[PDB]
């Protein structure tokens, strides 16, 4: 699941 936190991309 692609997550975007304040512009930063990560996979969780």
């Amino acid at each position, epitope marked *: *699941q*692609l997550i*975007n936190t304040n*512009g930063s991309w990560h*996979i969780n």
Partner: antibody, heavy 123, light 107 residues
Framework: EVQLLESGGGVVQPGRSLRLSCTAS????????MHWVRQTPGKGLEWLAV????????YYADSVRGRFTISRDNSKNTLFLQMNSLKTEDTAMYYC????????????????WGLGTLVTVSS | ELTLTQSPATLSLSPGERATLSCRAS??????LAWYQQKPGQAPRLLIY???NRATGIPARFSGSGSGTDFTLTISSLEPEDFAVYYC????????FGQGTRLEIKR
């Protein structure tokens, strides 16, 4: 051979809607995130939207949020962009693009682009 | 909001010469940077991702370096098929592109 064939482009009046399509072939569509990106001579390349492995996993640029909706139909290997409330400034070449999608541990880069389709918003 | 600035705007060279293209970020993007090539009438092609990794099918003469705010795309020895527009892209803070560098044949 990897292909991303686009359609749906054309002339549309301001305030009306268009739906763009991108049909993929030559790879396992289900396993890739996908993006729409547009280009104009004056503003250059502008990322618009991404959809990840799951249909509900989406993000948008501020410039199109609330007006454009990205979606995927895996059964037909097709990516869509529903474009509502169109403005003159939405005139552009529209590209569908495949995300590298964790291949070689990388993501959020555009590893394959379709030929693009021209949308002209005019009265 | 995070802006990328490419230089020079235009680069004039001949086949056989070394090409050096630059990309500077307004703030740090770590190694979260990619380079693309585009010829008139065609779609972009990915060259380099994560600052220094060469993409599939891309000839060894292309390479990338840098981190933080300063990055470089090098083409070791130019071929005629290499003249084109080159763009940078970051994915540290959302997604943005540079304005492009035109690589043209010198005469």
């Amino acid at each position: 051979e990897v292909q991303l064939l686009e359609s749906g482009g054309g002339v549309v009046q301001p305030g009306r809607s268009l739906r763009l399509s991108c049909t993929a072939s030559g790879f396992t569509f289900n396993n890739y995130g996908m993006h729409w990106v547009r280009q104009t001579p004056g503003k250059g390349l502008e990322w618009l939207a991404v959809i990840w492995f799951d249909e509900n996993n989406k993000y948008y640029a501020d410039s199109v949020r609330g007006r454009f909706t990205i979606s995927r139909d895996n059964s037909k290997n097709t990516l869509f962009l529903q474009m509502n409330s169109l403005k003159t400034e939405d005139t552009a070449m529209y590209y569908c693009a495949r995300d590298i999608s964790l291949v070689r541990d990388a993501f959020i880069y555009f590893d394959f682009w379709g030929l693009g389709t021209l949308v002209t918003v005019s009265s | 909001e995070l802006t990328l600035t490419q230089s020079p705007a235009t680069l004039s060279l001949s086949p056989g010469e070394r090409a050096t293209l630059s990309c500077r970020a307004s703030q740090s993007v770590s190694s979260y940077l990619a380079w693309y090539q585009q010829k008139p009438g065609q779609a972009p092609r990915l060259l380099i991702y994560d600052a220094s990794n060469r993409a599939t099918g891309i000839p060894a003469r292309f390479s990338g370096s840098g981190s933080g705010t300063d990055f470089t795309l090098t083409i070791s020895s130019l071929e005629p098929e290499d003249f084109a527009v080159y763009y940078c892209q970051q994915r540290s803070n959302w997604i943005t592109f540079g304005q492009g560098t035109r690589l043209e044949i010198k005469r």
